[PDB]
Design a protein around this nucleic acid. Structure first.
Ligand SMILES: [Mg+2]
Ligand SMILES: [Mg+2]
Ligand SMILES: [Mg+2]
Ligand SMILES: [Mg+2]
Ligand SMILES: [Mg+2]
Ligand SMILES: [Mg+2]
Ligand SMILES: [Mg+2]
Ligand SMILES: [Mg+2]
Ligand SMILES: [Mg+2]
Ligand SMILES: [Mg+2]
Ligand SMILES: [Mg+2]
Ligand SMILES: [Mg+2]
Ligand SMILES: [Mg+2]
Ligand SMILES: [Mg+2]
Ligand SMILES: [Mg+2]
Ligand SMILES: [Mg+2]
Ligand SMILES: [Mg+2]
Ligand SMILES: [Mg+2]
Ligand SMILES: [Mg+2]
Ligand SMILES: [Mg+2]
Ligand SMILES: [Mg+2]
Ligand SMILES: [Mg+2]
Ligand SMILES: [Mg+2]
Ligand SMILES: [Mg+2]
Ligand SMILES: [Mg+2]
Ligand SMILES: [Mg+2]
Ligand SMILES: [Mg+2]
Ligand SMILES: [Mg+2]
Ligand SMILES: [Mg+2]
Ligand SMILES: [Mg+2]
Ligand SMILES: [Mg+2]
Ligand SMILES: [Mg+2]
Ligand SMILES: [Mg+2]
Ligand SMILES: [Mg+2]
Ligand SMILES: [Mg+2]
Ligand SMILES: [Mg+2]
Ligand SMILES: [Mg+2]
Ligand SMILES: [Mg+2]
Ligand SMILES: [Mg+2]
Ligand SMILES: [Mg+2]
Ligand SMILES: [Mg+2]
Ligand SMILES: [Mg+2]
Ligand SMILES: [Mg+2]
Ligand SMILES: [Mg+2]
Ligand SMILES: [Mg+2]
Ligand SMILES: [Mg+2]
Ligand SMILES: [Zn+2]
Lengths: 220, 74, 110, 102
RNA sequence: CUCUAACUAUAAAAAUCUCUCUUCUC
RNA sequence: ACCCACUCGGCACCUUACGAGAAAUCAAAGUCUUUGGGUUCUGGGGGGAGUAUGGUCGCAAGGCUGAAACUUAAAGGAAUUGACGGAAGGGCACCACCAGGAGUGGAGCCUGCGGCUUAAUUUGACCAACACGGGGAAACUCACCAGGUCCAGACACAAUAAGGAUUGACAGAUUGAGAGCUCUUUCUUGAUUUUGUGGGUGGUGGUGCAUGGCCGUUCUUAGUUGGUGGAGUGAUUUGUCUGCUUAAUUGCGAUAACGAACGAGACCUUAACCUACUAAAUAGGGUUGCUGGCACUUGCCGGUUGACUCUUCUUAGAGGGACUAUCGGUUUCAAGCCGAUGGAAGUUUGAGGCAAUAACAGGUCUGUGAUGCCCUUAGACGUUCUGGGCCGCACGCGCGCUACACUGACGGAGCCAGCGAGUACAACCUUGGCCGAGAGGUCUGGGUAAUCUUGUGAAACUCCGUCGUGCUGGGGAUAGAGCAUUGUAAUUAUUGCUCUUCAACGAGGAAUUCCUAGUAAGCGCAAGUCAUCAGCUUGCGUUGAUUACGUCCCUGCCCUUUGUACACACC
RNA sequence: UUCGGGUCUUGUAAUUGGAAUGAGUACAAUGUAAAUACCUUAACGAGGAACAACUGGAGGGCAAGUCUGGUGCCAGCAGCCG
């Protein structure tokens, strides 16, 4: 691969110069991401799988315009997930664009403990929920070694998350696959979005690494 | 854009005019004079050359090497 | 796509390949695979765009392939060197205007 | 609407369980009733490949196949368009008690 | 940084419609 | 009574989502998976059906209560894009109309369909089929029909078989045949064959609803599309727009849009303008020779491969020239639109050629040795030969032709073009001199081409005469005879010419076509087809107009808004 | 320098051997009231180990065929979509 890449998007300049060791500070400081090789460079271990491609059809005066909407999911199996939804004319182009979208939308997870912790927390910290369309998805912490009790789609999403045991409870028209995946995704993104006790104390409000390295960005 | 009817024939048959497998026409052609001279039979072709025997039909001896050339009365 | 990628690699500024026939099925189909850009109308269509058509014999029948290649006008010998509407403004050389009075003298020459 | 469509034939004789019949009236739902030339009024169903491809109407000699288990009903197969019907009357395979002309 | 003015004037009748519905995988 | 700042209560409203919802939307339809304020009453797919029955109130109408058997994979909700709308808005088009012009539809002819008939009248198209398949078929073309030949069945194997696989055959019978097709006979021929099995060819056989290619149409309009970006859960949307402007999604602009691509334009061919250039016996002109006629003044008109010279005219290269130029109006003064002048040209200068995305079950296997599949492959759907038809006739329909006459017909006389094309392995264009009334033939010519046909001396038209309102000298079909010409072959008349016959026809109902300047219309000519054949067709030029220079009323088209139970989309 | 040793392994062969053994028989004994049967065990009892595994299904739902031939909106299949 010839990954030439003039830096765009100062974040990109910093990562290319190597000032960003990994995504944690990005996610810490809520940095905007618009390009994918940032995820490629920082996380060299993204696995991906095209969940489903749907023929999406529009009606025009001359026959019907057909496109393909791919719903693809990328992850590391170690606590990072992204979901790409993308339509395009050719199937392969759709899949590649969806891959890029998913890498753009990588979101972290809070792998918690079902109780009486041990090494390497397996389950989710707290019950979370996510709504997309009629799909309301419940994620519940699960005892170690109970597996991923979930529908195949969200089960695969969980597997890409790296979580080992979670309970799921869906309601609505989960037949709609993109809605289901998107709901489960927003829910798993909500895993941080829940002030747990053990996280009480005020933090130090670290300077933005993207700020203090301004002089390496904005190529002269 | 059409279906064809079978070619029904009001004609009994016409078969290949089979050539006749002649058994030893040369004994018919020649005549041996007792371990010596040998004569030929019924003519020799002057239009074609020596050795080509002619045809016996009636009131005319006929060619067939150069068929149309020689058919003369004798 | 290998063909079109090769065409782009070769430096032409636009490629198109069209395949019609029984693509894996019975009902006729015709898919187009294009990249860059191609001009369709106007005499430059003959001036630059090469075109070829071939019939391919597959077990189910015949597949029509059409190839269109839009040659780069810059490297087009024996013809116009650019598109009809390609306007090339030229950068004017700059000079410093401070030399107002500047009386000058050369030696007289025969 | 011929562009949506699939886009001098000969007669066919009845063969061991089928008969020429004359439609007496056209019944609804796609059915029909025809007199078979046996002194009987049978109930014919307009078969597929036939429904809205080639039409038929009253007073038209038409081929119908019987169903071996229930003689009281039958299904119509092949239509005859008013000129080989005269030929059918000529060849005498079916009784000529029913002449149809306008 | 001072405001609230124009306006027109038509209709008659037109009912129905036989098929054939067919994939998106790199 | 008002003004202000209030506050309590009421109908409500606007903005927004940071909450909800599936959304439309809601300040409650929020405080609901992070699921619990208190409470009543309703529903569990749609139909059956608020129907059956029993109660109950009512005079009656009927109300409340209230099923089931059974029948189905949907019904339904909201929104999206299209289509559609006898919905709205703003723009367009002589394949729409207006003003009109020319007509077609009436007549006879021709030609193509249908129908009928036939052995065959071979076939495919039903705005975008019908003078189309270049389809102007006498043999062929060939597809159909009556018939006769032949195998153009490679190759593999087996089988016969060299005491011959076999082929060919005069003459006769027989055949339309002078076909050894078949036969009588006899001959000739020699391993290329023959007959069985595969196998392969061939096919204007079928299947354009298997297909490629091809063009036609949707669609002569101006419309398409992706990349990040925003909106939506999404179908998608914005960019592609409120306005004005243009022929144009053409620009001015305004703008959750930004920059880009196709289409339009730009571009190419042609038409025009170049006393500027380059030149020219395959184009012209001047002077000047040598000659003809006349006037005689040295003037004209002519001829002339003489000499010199020239290039305006004719050619074709380089180029030049216009871009709305200049000015006056109008225009949020911008996009442009209008008017005058200059000009050759001021409609995109006129006419064109290419011409986007998507699509059609549009046509074409009958153009192809483009082609899948299927069919046939020896008395054949192969191929060939003879003859018939494709052109038949109770009828209807579409292109066109000649006419209905006086702006005419017929005689004379005048005498002007522009696109072409043209003989080779064969035979074209044909000048001229002959003859014939004519078609024509004849002998010599020139021309493989600005050279010759050719200045294609064309028609309408122009001038002078005859005819005279008469179905008449209009009209020329239908009809006999003759002379020729192409053709192996003209009968079922190829075509031309000569004479005679002279029919139908009185400006053509409802309808309907085409068209805005060198235009319509009239008028021919050249080329395709061609041996011979046009009424067709492409192109060309000539004589050359009436009437608009506008509008959505009919028929459609663009886009926007809106409504929909439509999506095979108002058939 | 192409190699090719298969150098190390895996599979695939109507090639090819010798092992091992039960289902079945069956001496017996045990087992039982008597017995069957089991649990043991003599001797028998595998080559195609014919000592033979069926039942449904291969468009989706849903794992598996765009293989062959047949029928040709018929027969039929299909819980639904078809
Ligand atoms: Mg363009
Ligand atoms: Mg069709
Ligand atoms: Mg039926
Ligand atoms: Mg009716
Ligand atoms: Mg119900
Ligand atoms: Mg009801
Ligand atoms: Mg009651
Ligand atoms: Mg609705
Ligand atoms: Mg009019
Ligand atoms: Mg006329
Ligand atoms: Mg007429
Ligand atoms: Mg016919
Ligand atoms: Mg049209
Ligand atoms: Mg002819
Ligand atoms: Mg003929
Ligand atoms: Mg013939
Ligand atoms: Mg024959
Ligand atoms: Mg052919
Ligand atoms: Mg088609
Ligand atoms: Mg986007
Ligand atoms: Mg849009
Ligand atoms: Mg253009
Ligand atoms: Mg000049
Ligand atoms: Mg001005
Ligand atoms: Mg033009
Ligand atoms: Mg177009
Ligand atoms: Mg074929
Ligand atoms: Mg043939
Ligand atoms: Mg004809
Ligand atoms: Mg008529
Ligand atoms: Mg026509
Ligand atoms: Mg006259
Ligand atoms: Mg005259
Ligand atoms: Mg001329
Ligand atoms: Mg003349
Ligand atoms: Mg007269
Ligand atoms: Mg005339
Ligand atoms: Mg023609
Ligand atoms: Mg106008
Ligand atoms: Mg019209
Ligand atoms: Mg529908
Ligand atoms: Mg209707
Ligand atoms: Mg067994
Ligand atoms: Mg089965
Ligand atoms: Mg089985
Ligand atoms: Mg499967
Ligand atoms: Zn001889």
């Amino acid at each position: 691969e010839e990954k030439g890449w003039v830096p765009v998007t100062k974040l990109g300049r910093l990562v290319k110069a190597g000032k960003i060791s990994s995504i944690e500070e990005i996610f810490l400081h809520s940095l905007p991401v618009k390009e994918f090789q940032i995820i490629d460079q920082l996380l060299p271990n993204l696995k991906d799988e095209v969940m489903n491609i749907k023929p999406v059809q529009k009606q025009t005066r001359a026959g019907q315009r057909t496109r393909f909407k791919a719903v693809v999911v990328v992850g590391d199996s170690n606590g990072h997930v992204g979901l790409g939804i993308k339509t395009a004319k050719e199937v392969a182009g759709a899949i590649r664009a969806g891959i890029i979208i998913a890498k753009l939308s990588v979101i972290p997870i809070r792998r918690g403990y079902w109780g009486t912790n041990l090494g390497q927390p397996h389950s989710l910290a707290t019950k979370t929920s996510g709504k997309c369309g009629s799909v309301s998805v419940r994620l519940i912490p699960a005892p170690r070694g109970s597996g991923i009790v979930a529908s195949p789609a969200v089960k695969k999403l969980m597997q890409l998350a790296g979580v080992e045991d979670v309970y799921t409870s869906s309601t609505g028209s989960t037949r709609t696959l993109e809605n289901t995946l998107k709901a489960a995704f927003v829910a798993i993104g909500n895993t941080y979005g829940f002030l747990t006790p053990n996280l009480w104390e005020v933090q130090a409000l670290t300077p933005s690494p993207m700020d203090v390295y301004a002089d390496y960005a904005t190529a002269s | 854009g059409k279906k064809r009817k079978k070619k029904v024939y009001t004609t009994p048959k016409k078969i290949r005019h089979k050539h006749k497998k002649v058994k030893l026409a040369v004994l018919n052609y020649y005549k041996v004079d007792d371990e010596g001279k040998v004569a030929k039979l019924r003519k020799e072709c002057p239009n074609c050359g020596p050795g080509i025997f002619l045809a016996n039909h009636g009131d005319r001896f006929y060619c067939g090497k150069c068929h149309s050339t020689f058919a003369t009365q004798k | 796509y290998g063909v079109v990628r090769y065409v782009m690699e070769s430096g032409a500024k636009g490629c198109e390949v069209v395949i019609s026939g029984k693509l894996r099925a019975a009902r006729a189909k015709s898919m187009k695979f294009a990249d860059g850009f191609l001009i369709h109308s106007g005499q430059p269509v003959n001036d630059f765009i090469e075109t070829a058509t071939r019939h391919v014999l597959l077990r189910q029948g015949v597949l029509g392939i059409k190839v269109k290649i839009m040659k780069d006008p810059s490297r087009n010998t024996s013809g116009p060197k650019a598109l009809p509407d390609a306007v090339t403004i030229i950068e004017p050389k700059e000079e410093e205007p401070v030399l107002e009075p500047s009386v000058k003298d050369y030696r007289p020459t025969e | 609407k011929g562009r949506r469509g699939k886009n001098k034939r000969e007669l066919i004789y009845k063969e061991e369980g089928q008969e020429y019949a004359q439609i007496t009236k056209m019944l609804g739902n796609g059915r029909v009733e025809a007199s078979c030339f046996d002194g009987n009024k049978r109930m014919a169903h307009i078969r597929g490949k036939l429904r809205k491809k080639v039409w038929m109407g009253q007073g038209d000699i038409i081929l119908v196949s019987l169903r071996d288990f229930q003689d009281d009903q039958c299904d119509v197969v092949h239509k005859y368009n008013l000129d080989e019907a005269r030929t059918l009357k000529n060849q005498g395979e079916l009784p000529e008690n029913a002449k149809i002309n306008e």
